C-alpha cells in the first residue's frame, strides 16, 4: 500500500467524463474538471488539461498522468500550507497517506478547516481525533471512504484497505 493505490481504491478509474458524488464533472482518477453545470465547460477543461481534442474521453495513460499531477499537487500544497505542514511532518508514514487522501478529495483549504482534528492528530491522540473527524459533512456525505481514512489515522495500519 501507498498513496497512489490508496487513492486508486477510493476514487476508482473512469475514462469518460462522469459526475462525482457532488454532481460535478470529473474524469479519470478523481480529477475534477469543473464545478460548472455545463457539459461543454467540462469538455473544454478536459481538452485544455490533456492537450488534445478528447471528445470527453481519455486513455488509461492519460488518466495516470493527471493522477500523478494531482498527487503531487496535494503533497505540494500540504507542504506549503502553514497549518498542514506541521501535522504532516509529525505523522508516521502510514498516517501521512491519510492526510494526503483528505487533501486530494477536499483540497488544502477544506482540510486546514478541521482545526481541532488537526491538533489532536498532531498530539497523537488517535481515538479522539477519529471521533472528531467523524463530526463532519465529509463523514456524513461519504461515510464508507471517511471510515477508511479515519481508521487509517486511528490504527496507523492499512487494514481498512485490505
Ligand atoms: Cl456532525
Ligand atoms: Cl462513501
Curated annotation (Swiss-Prot):
Its EC number is 3.2.1.17. Changing residue 117 to V: 50-fold decrease in enzymatic activity. The active site is at 11 (proton donor/acceptor), 20 (proton donor/acceptor). Substrate binds at residues 32, 104, 117, 132. GO terms for cellular component: host cell cytoplasm. It is an enzyme of class 3 (hydrolase). Changing residue 20 to C: Nearly no effet on specific enzymatic activity. It is found in: Host cytoplasm. Optimum pH is 7.3. Endolysin with lysozyme activity that degrades host peptidoglycans and participates with the holin and spanin proteins in the sequential events which lead to the programmed host cell lysis releasing the mature viral particles. Once the holin has permeabilized the host cell membrane, the endolysin can reach the periplasm and break down the peptidoglycan layer. HAMAP family: ENDOLYSIN_T4. This is Endolysin. It comes from Enterobacteria phage T4 (Bacteriophage T4). The lineage of its organism: Viruses, Duplodnaviria, Heunggongvirae, Uroviricota, Caudoviricetes.
